[PDB]
Design a protein around this ligand. Structure first.
Ligand SMILES: CC(C)NC(=O)N1CCN(C(=O)c2ccco2)CC1
Length: 119
């Protein structure tokens, strides 16, 4: 029932994501010189370095907020992809499955700890 345990759990999961080859396109904010129409399609850029820095700054209150930003990485990739068969979109779908498999216990444990705290 540790209300703070999610933060190190999320740091560890981000470490695993940075070791995945599938994260390489998503580790840093998109380069607009490579993709000059990106901000015509994507309103809110997001990447894993931004998520890690926000976490380490103490600017997430809950793992739900981190999860929303990570899911934005994946919805941006789906929105920007010219094809469902894209290399970089295909990498996003595997990485998303990995992330979702690992974040589910982090969210469940946090929400259970908060319920215990307010019992
Ligand atoms: C750090 C750097 C390597 N990032 C990028 O230049 N990428 C990452 C995100 N991208 C896509 O989600 C996408 C879908 C289909 C084609 O690109 C756009 C391009």
């Amino acid at each position: 029932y540790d209300i703070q345990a999610w933060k190190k759990q999320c740091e560890e999961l981000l470490n695993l994501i940075f070791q995945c080859e599938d994260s390489e396109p998503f580790r840093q904010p998109v380069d607009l010189l490579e993709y000059p129409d990106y901000r015509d399609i994507i309103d809110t850029p997001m990447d894993f370095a931004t998520v890690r820095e926000t976490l380490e700054a103490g600017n997430y209150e809950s793992p739900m907020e981190l999860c929303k930003d990570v899911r934005l990485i994946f919805s941006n990739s789906k929105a920007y992809t010219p094809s469902k068969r894209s290399r970089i979109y295909s990498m996003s779908l595997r990485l998303s499955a990995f992330f979702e498999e690992h974040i589910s216990s982090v969210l469940s444990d946090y929400k259970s700890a908060l319920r215990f705290h307010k019992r």
